[PDB]
């Protein structure tokens, strides 16, 4: 399952966008002054939420956990999810795959508060805690339990006696390992596998291109280059032409800002769902029918993805 | 009274329109680098219209 | 007190080797706190707690705590 | 990821606390090791992770620091302790050793 | 009971002024 | 009683290829990553290459990349480094080491060091 | 442990009052809502003093000076600007209101699941294993007090999947087999209450070959001593 969690943080300087370092334009823009401030304030709010979204999904447990250096926990490999030195950011094999598939004026992009390395470290801790302490590290003191025995508890939750697991331990382990192996192949073969995450990237880029393009529209003025009007017409006449441009450019920003607000709301909804799944699916065994995959849920593993999270 | 240009803290107060400023990071200004000089390059034409 | 950060140049803050919980976010994993001069430090994800994992070892709670949260 | 180790050399008397500092170009989380090299001897692993002493290593050696800055401390210098010391990051291939610090008697 | 921002005030805060026990009149002068 | 023994270090002309073999005894060979480290006479220790238990993860130093191959045989308990396009800078004392971890996971470090072998590159 | 539990509960409640008072930012979430609305409304009012390109921002003045034909032009500028200011305000409220509605729906869900029942969701109703919740009214909002059970004072014991007696595997019907030193017992998983292994608390699944890790021990039988 793939869920979008955050969107790129963009800050636009309204004055620079509308007026290209032109004092004349700035003075005209003093009229209806509040507009400029309102815009910057709105975008700022959007940026702050993006950080909040990420913390809610990943920064839930504040303790780092490490798995023992052993090859199999009762025959369950777990190798693919665990961190690898060869991978670029010390990420897991699957996570590495995920990051490969996803691909002036006053506009600027603000760096995310939590770097990818930090997010990667959070995922590993969650994963390690689950493999060694089951669902107890999210509800209080983390207590160790043999992994094979943990699965027996999971079987009782779905409604099957524990003997079933112990008598078919080997079979279950092989099945689990085989399924994990297919995951890598699945993501690679299906190009549209990460379409959901990719869509978010495209929409933001698309919007930003449009904003930039709008700067070349006349909106009824003689020209779309502010300096030209200033370099030709006299002050009285120039005002008229400049006003046309200001009006059009001002409108273009509001449209952009409005779309981001609505779009951001959608992402926030998605982030909240992701947060819920992290707590219910990963830090416990859910009884909801299809909240955590199809079939009777046993356990879930979190893998970081660009601007999002992937749940196994 | 508050002199906005006196110092960054003063400027922050003017932006927030409140004398008291709470803990946090506030964006109160924009920075530009002024042009050192003006350079004019025109064609070299001696002929008079 | 001129320091270079991914976010940008930072002035008036003293870099600190020690990592602390984030107080004021500067971005790119850098946070600033007032400890008296303002200090800039990399945020700390958390403390390291690892359960000893063995194939035949279990930990059973012997007491309980009732907690009320808001 | 370059590792810078300071000071290059120091001279200390027996019974004197010794501090050696290793810095990293980018954050390495807790992956670091301290290695003791003696002439005619294979290097020895004093500390792994950040502060975890290897079995068989005297208590005087201690490890501290996280992220970019890391430190190695010897509570009391001993005649046996006089050897070069190196810091190796284990974060990602390629692992990089530090220049090294030579400890000698005054 | 309101806070108003205006550009009328012309005196820079915390500025050392000349001390005297003809002086140019530049954009107004503060005399004490 | 974990013993690592190096062999195959000898004088070689520049541009030739040489192979280093490390013999492993006293521990389970297929349960730990292995690394190669070289000590230059005039320079500090330099890490050369590392391999995981199953050979899934392999890393090389930037200087040696594309000329050095590290391979391991679990059945024979042997670690092999293949060196090609040898140069004067390569001359050093080469050590085969045993990683505390498996080359994957959370535990890392060079627990055991072999006595070492000397490779000299000269005309 | 009734007495102990009651004291613990009472102590926790006592801290609640102190917590809210000490932490000024405790009700920041509710406070934010108030500020945003006020902020928006101030801006709207302020906008009435903008010229938007007209000679003046006071409608009466234009009316008291320029003649009807000319006044129209000036008034139109003001109308256009003021009209735009309202739409911006209205749009923000719509988006903001949507956010509040989402929050209200969540609050409603918690009232039904956390207060009117015991929830099994991991962290839907506080951290730990949820026991009960109490609702307290707050300005423009609600405050939920969540009572949870947090395990404490852990001890480590050796464990076995099954016990082999007379060639029959025994699996605990409820709980886990623990061993302190050389004695094997069966205990409930959440709390440590060691009890002697007996036929009553364990069930027999088969022989002693398939299971991996099975340990040998004696399973007491209640009927045998009477007989
Ligand atoms: C479980 O923990 C409680 C505290 O949460 C223990 O009760 C305390 O006992 C000590 C003596 O050992 C007293 O000094 C405290 O006043 C008690 N606290 C309270 C709130 O009553 C209790 O003894 C623990 N139970 C076990 C079996 O260890
Ligand atoms: C855990 O799974 C990995 C694969 O994800 C297994 O390692 C691979 O084994 C094959 C041979 O079976 C090699 O060709 C590959 O080079 C190995 N690595 C990778 C990354 O594919 C590993 O054997 C499994 N663990 C156990 C204990 O069986
Ligand atoms: C548990 O008890 C059974 C039965 O008493 C033991 O089975 C014996 O195992 C030994 C060693 O393999 C054999 O030489 C005997 O012939 C077996 N006896 C029977 C009746 O099968 C078993 O070894 C015991 N397990 C442990 C760990 O002591
Ligand atoms: C608990 O763990 C310790 C090691 O930390 C061990 O010595 C002890 O035997 C364990 N307890 C039991 C009951 O096995
Ligand atoms: C294990 O605990 C039980 C509890 O009653 C006790 O009877 C037995 O003697 C203990 N064994 C030890 C401490 O070796
Ligand atoms: C548990 O691991 C130990 C090695 O530490 C091994 O000797 C033992 O057989 C294992 N137990 C089971 C049930 O696999």
Atom of ligand 4 nearest to the CA of G179: 13
Distances (CA, A) of G200 to G126, G194, G207: 37, 15, 19
Chains D and E touch (3+ CB pairs under 8 A): no
Distance CA D104, CA D13 (A): 9
- Gap from CA of F54 to ligand 2 centroid (Å): 7
- Gap from CA of A24 to ligand 3 centroid (Å): 98
> Chain D residues with CB-CB distance to C under 8 A?
27, 30, 65-69
- Judged by CB atoms closer than 8 Å, whether chains meet at A89 and D93 is answered as no
**What is the phi-psi region of residue F111: left when phi exceeds 0, alpha when psi lies from -120 to 50, beta otherwise?**
alpha
CA-closest candidate to residue A268, choices G106, F85, B22, G50: G106
Distance CA G227, CA G223 (A): 6
Distance CA C19, CA E5 (A): 41
For residue G186, list its beta bridge partners.
G177, G195
- Gap from CA of G213 to ligand 5 centroid (Å): 22
Task: Tell me the torsion sign for CA atoms A72, A75, A80, A81.
Answer: negative
Beta strands at G163-165 and G168-172: parallel, antiparallel or unpaired:
antiparallel
Nearest by CB to residue F103, choosing from A67, A85, A128, is: A85
- Judged by CB atoms closer than 8 Å, whether chains meet at B1 and E9 is answered as yes
- Gap from CA of A56 to ligand 4 centroid (Å): 37
G214 lines ligand 3 (CB under 6 A): no
C&G contacts, CB < 8 Å: 93
Chains B and A touch (3+ CB pairs under 8 A): yes
Say which residues have a Cβ less than 8 Å from residue C11's Cβ, sequence separation at least 6: C1, C2, C3
Distance CA G136, CA D75 (A): 57
By CB neighbour count within 10 A (0-12 exposed, 13-18 middle, 19+ buried), where does D88 fall? buried
- Judged by CB atoms closer than 8 Å, whether chains meet at A89 and D92 is answered as yes
Q: Is residue D100 a contact partner of residue D10, using CB atoms and an 8 Å limit?
A: no
Element containing residue D7 per DSSP (H, E): none
CA-closest candidate to residue G134, choices G6, G126, A279, G3: G126
- Helical packing angle, A116-133 and A93-101, nearest 10°: 140
User: Could you write out the DSSP letters of every residue in chain F?
Assistant: --EEEEE---EE-TT--EEEEEEEESS-GGGS-EEEEEE-SSS-EEEEEEE-SSS--EEE-TTTTTTEEEEEETTTTEEEEEE-S--GGG-EEEEEEEESS-SSSS---EEEE---EEEEE--
Element containing residue G122 per DSSP (H, E): none
Tallying the residues shown for chain F, one arrives at: 123
Say which residues have a Cβ less than 8 Å from residue F82's Cβ, sequence separation at least 6: F17, F19, F20, F68, F69, F70, F71
Break chain D down into helix, strand, coil percent, rounded to 5: 0, 45, 55
By CB neighbour count within 10 A (0-12 exposed, 13-18 middle, 19+ buried), where does G71 fall? middle
Touching G (3+ Cβ pairs <8 A), the chains are A, C
**Residue bearing tokens 């990089």:** D96
Beta strands at F11-12 and F117-121: parallel, antiparallel or unpaired:
parallel
| Tokens describing residue A261 | 């607000």
Peptide bond into F102 cis (omega under 30): no
For residue D53, list its beta bridge partners.
D47
Q: Is residue D13 a contact partner of residue D99, using CB atoms and an 8 Å limit?
A: no
Say which residues have a Cβ less than 8 Å from residue F121's Cβ, sequence separation at least 6: F11, F12, F13, F14, F86, F87, F88, F90, F91
Q: Is residue G29 a contact partner of residue G23, using CB atoms and an 8 Å limit?
A: no
CA-closest candidate to residue A54, choices A119, A148, A127: A119
**Residue bearing tokens 């073969």:** A189
User: Could you write out the DSSP letters of every residue in chain A?
Assistant: -EEE----EEEE-HHHHHSSS-HHHHHHHHTTTHHHHHHHHHHHHHHHHHHHHHHHHHTT--EE----S-S-BTTB--TTTSB-SSSTTS-BHHHHHHHHH---TTEEEEPPSS-HHHHHHHHHHHHHHHHHHTTSSSSSS-----HHHHHHHHHHHHT--HHHHHHTHHHHHHHHHHHHHHHHHHHHH-GGGGHHHHHHHHHHHHHHHHHHHHTT--TTSS-S-HHHHHHHS-HHHHHHHHHHHHHHHHHHHHHHHHHHHHHHHHHHHHHHHHHHHIIIIISS---SSSTTSSSS-----EEEETTEEEE-
Q: What are phi and psi of G152, to 5 degrees?
A: -155, 165
Distances (CA, A) of D2 to D25, D27, D85, D94, D96: 6, 11, 16, 10, 7
Say which residues have a Cβ less than 8 Å from residue A75's Cβ, sequence separation at least 6: A148, A169, A170, A173, A174, A177
CA C41 distance to own-chain centroid = 10
Q: How far is E17 from chain B (nearest CA, A)?
A: 16
- Judged by CB atoms closer than 8 Å, whether chains meet at A128 and F53 is answered as no
Dihedral Cα A136, A140, A144, A148, nearest 10 deg: 0
Element containing residue E4 per DSSP (H, E): none
Q: Is residue D24 a contact partner of residue D70, using CB atoms and an 8 Å limit?
A: yes
Distance CA G45, CA C32 (A): 37
- Gap from CA of G156 to ligand 4 centroid (Å): 6
Distance CA A64, CA A133 (A): 13
The number of C-alpha atoms within 13 Å of G155 and in the hemisphere containing its C-beta is 12
Task: Tell me the torsion sign for CA atoms A84, A89, A95, A99.
Answer: negative
Residue G103 in 3-state DSSP? helix
Q: How far is G150 from chain A (nearest CA, A)?
A: 6
Q: What are phi and psi of A30, to 5 degrees?
A: -60, -35
Task: Tell me the torsion sign for CA atoms A192, A194, A200, A202.
Answer: negative
Distance CA G184, CA G195 (A): 9
For residue A92, list its beta bridge partners.
A83
- Judged by CB atoms closer than 8 Å, whether chains meet at G151 and C69 is answered as no
Distance CA A233, CA D99 (A): 67
For residue C68, list its beta bridge partners.
G147
Ligand nearest to the CA of G187: 5
Q: What are phi and psi of A194, to 5 degrees?
A: -100, 30
B&E contacts, CB < 8 Å: 12
- Helical packing angle, G28-47 and A34-58, nearest 10°: 160
Ligand 2 neighbours by CB, cut-off 6 Å: A 71-72, 77, 79-80; F 54-56
Distance CA G219, CA G198 (A): 5
Nearest by CB to residue G150, choosing from A135, A140, A243, is: A140
Break chain E down into helix, strand, coil percent, rounded to 5: 0, 0, 100
Q: Is residue F95 a contact partner of residue F20, using CB atoms and an 8 Å limit?
A: no
């Amino acid at each position: 399952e793939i869920l979008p969690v955050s969107m790129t943080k963009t800050s636009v300087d309204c004055t620079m966008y509308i007026c290209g370092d032109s004092t004349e334009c700035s003075n005209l823009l003093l009229q209806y002054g509040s507009f400029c401030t309102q815009l910057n304030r709105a975008l700022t709010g959007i940026a702050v939420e993006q950080d909040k979204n990420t913390q809610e999904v990943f920064a839930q447990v504040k303790q780092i956990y490490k798995t023992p250096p052993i090859k199999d926990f009762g025959g369950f490999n777990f190798s693919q999810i665990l961190p690898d030195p060869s991978k670029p950011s010390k990420r897991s094999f699957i996570e590495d795959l995920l990051f490969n598939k996803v691909t002036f004026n006053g506009l600027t992009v603000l760096p995310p508060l939590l770097t990818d390395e930090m997010i990667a470290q959070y995922t590993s801790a969650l994963l390690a805690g689950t493999i060694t302490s089951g669902w107890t590290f999210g509800a209080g003191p983390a207590l160790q339990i043999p992994f094979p025995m943990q699965m027996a508890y999971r079987f009782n939750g779905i409604g099957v006696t524990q003997n079933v697991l112990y008598e078919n331990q080997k079979l279950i382990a092989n099945q689990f390992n085989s399924a994990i192996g297919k995951i890598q192949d699945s993501l690679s073969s299906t190009p549209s596998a990460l379409g959901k995450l990719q869509d978010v990237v495209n929409q933001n880029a698309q919007a930003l291109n449009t904003l930039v393009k709008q700067l070349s529209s006349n909106f009824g003025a003689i020209s779309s280059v502010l300096n030209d009007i200033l370099s030709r017409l006299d002050p009285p006449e120039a005002e008229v032409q400049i006003d046309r441009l200001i009006t059009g450019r001002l409108q273009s920003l509001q449209t952009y800002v409005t779309q981001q607000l609505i779009r951001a709301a959608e992402i926030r909804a998605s982030a909240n769902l992701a947060a819920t799944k992290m707590s219910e699916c990963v830090l416990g065994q859910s009884k909801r029918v299809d909240f955590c995959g199809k079939g009777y849920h046993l356990m879930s593993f979190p893998q970081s993805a660009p601007h999002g999270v992937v749940f196994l | 009274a508050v002199d906005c240009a006196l110092d960054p803290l003063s400027e922050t107060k003017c932006t927030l329109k409140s004398f008291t400023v709470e803990k946090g990071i506030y964006q109160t200004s924009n920075f530009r680098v002024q042009p050192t000089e003006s350079i004019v390059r025109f064609p070299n034409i001696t002929n008079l219209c | 007190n001129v320091f270079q950060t991914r976010a940008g140049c930072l002035i008036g803050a003293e870099h600190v080797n020690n990592s602390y919980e984030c107080d004021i976010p500067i971005g790119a994993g850098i946070c600033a706190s007032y400890q008296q001069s303002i200090i800039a430090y990399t945020m700390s994800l958390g403390a390291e707690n690892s359960v000893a994992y063995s194939n035949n070892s279990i930990a059973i709670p012997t007491n309980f705590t009732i907690s009320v949260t808001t | 990821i370059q590792m810078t180790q300071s000071p290059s050399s120091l001279s200390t008397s027996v019974g004197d606390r010794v501090t050696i500092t290793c810095r990293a170009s980018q954050g390495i989380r807790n992956d670091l090791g301290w290695y003791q090299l003696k002439p005619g001897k294979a290097p020895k692993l004093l500390i792994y992770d950040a502060s975890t002493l290897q079995s068989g290593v005297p208590s005087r050696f201690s490890g501290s620091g996280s992220g970019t800055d890391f430190t190695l401390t010897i509570s009391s210098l001993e005649p046996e302790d006089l050897a070069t010391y190196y810091c190796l990051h284990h974060y990602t291939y390629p692992w990089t050793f530090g220049h090294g610090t030579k400890v000698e008697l005054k | 009971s309101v806070l108003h921002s205006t550009q009328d005030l012309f005196l820079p805060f915390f500025s050392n002024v000349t001390w005297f026990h003809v002086l140019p009149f530049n954009d107004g002068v503060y005399f004490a | 009683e974990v013993q690592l023994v190096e062999s195959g270090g000898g004088l070689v002309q520049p541009g030739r290829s040489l192979r280093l073999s490390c013999a492993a005894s006293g521990f389970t060979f297929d349960d730990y990553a292995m690394h190669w480290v070289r000590q230059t006479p005039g320079k500090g220790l330099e890490w050369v290459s590392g391999i995981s238990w199953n050979s899934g993860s392999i890393g090389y130093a930037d200087s040696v990349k594309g000329r050095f191959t590290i391979s391991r045989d679990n059945a024979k308990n042997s670690l092999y480094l293949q060196m090609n396009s040898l140069r004067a800078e390569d001359t050093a004392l080469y050590y085969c080491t045993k990683d505390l971890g498996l080359g994957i996971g959370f535990y890392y470090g060079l627990d055991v060091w072999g006595q070492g072998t000397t490779v000299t590159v000269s005309s | 442990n009734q007495k102990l539990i009651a004291n613990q509960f009472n102590s926790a409640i006592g801290k609640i009052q102190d917590s809210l008072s000490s932490t000024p930012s405790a009700l920041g979430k509710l406070q934010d809502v108030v500020n945003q609305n006020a902020q928006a409304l101030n801006t709207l009012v302020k906008q009435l003093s903008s010229n938007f390109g007209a000679i003046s921002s006071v409608l009466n003045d234009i009316l008291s000076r320029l003649d009807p034909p000319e006044a129209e032009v000036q008034i139109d500028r003001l109308i256009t600007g003021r009209l735009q200011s309202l739409q911006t305000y209205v749009t923000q409220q719509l988006i903001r209101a949507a956010e509040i509605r989402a929050s209200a729906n969540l609050a409603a869900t918690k009232m039904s699941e956390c207060v009117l029942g015991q929830s099994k969701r991991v962290d839907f109703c506080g951290k730990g294993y949820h026991l009960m919740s109490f609702p307290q009214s707050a300005p423009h909002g609600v405050v939920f007090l969540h009572v949870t059970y947090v395990p404490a004072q852990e001890k480590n014991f050796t464990t076995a999947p099954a016990i082999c007696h007379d060639g029959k595997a025994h699996f605990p019907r409820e709980g886990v087999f623990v061993s302190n030193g050389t004695h094997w017992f069966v205990t409930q998983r959440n709390f440590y209450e060691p009890q002697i292994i007996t036929t009553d608390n364990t069930f027999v699944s088969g022989n002693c070959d398939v299971v991996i890790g099975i340990v040998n021990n004696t399973v007491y039988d209640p009927l045998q001593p009477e007989l």
